[PDB]
Design goal:
part of a larger assembly; 2 chains; A: about 50 residues; mainly alpha; B: about 50 residues; mainly beta; two-stranded antiparallel ribbon; rod-shaped; Neck protein (chain A); Capsid protein (chain B); virus; phage
Chain lengths: ~50, ~50
């Protein structure tokens, strides 16, 4: 994600704190969820009892 | 050969200056945006050379 934003850095203007990897992972998990709905798919390996 | 002759020259010399007064001498900003804490920065002086 940072690579695609190369040359852009995001910080809290009130502090010197940039957003940590926790937010990115959290966002990425919901992004891969959203894509999983956008096509009727399973997108990570997962056992099913059907 | 030029013991009692006159001599004249057209010459090139480097530009030079001295500060004869300091004018609008200090301008200031408490820069705070995108800083851990308030910071003081001295903005450009104007010099009368």
């Amino acid at each position: 994600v940072k690579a695609y934003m190369f040359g852009i850095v995001v910080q809290n203007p009130d502090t010197g704190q940039p957003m940590g990897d926790e937010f990115y992972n959290h966002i990425l998990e919901r992004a891969v969820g959203k894509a999983e709905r956008a096509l009727d798919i399973s997108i990570l390996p997962d056992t099913q009892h059907e | 050969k030029y013991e009692n002759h006159t001599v004249t020259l057209k010459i090139l010399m480097t530009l030079r200056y001295v500060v004869s007064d300091i004018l609008k001498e200090s301008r200031y900003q408490y820069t705070k945006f995108n800083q851990p804490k308030s910071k003081f920065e001295n903005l450009p002086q104007k010099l009368l050379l």
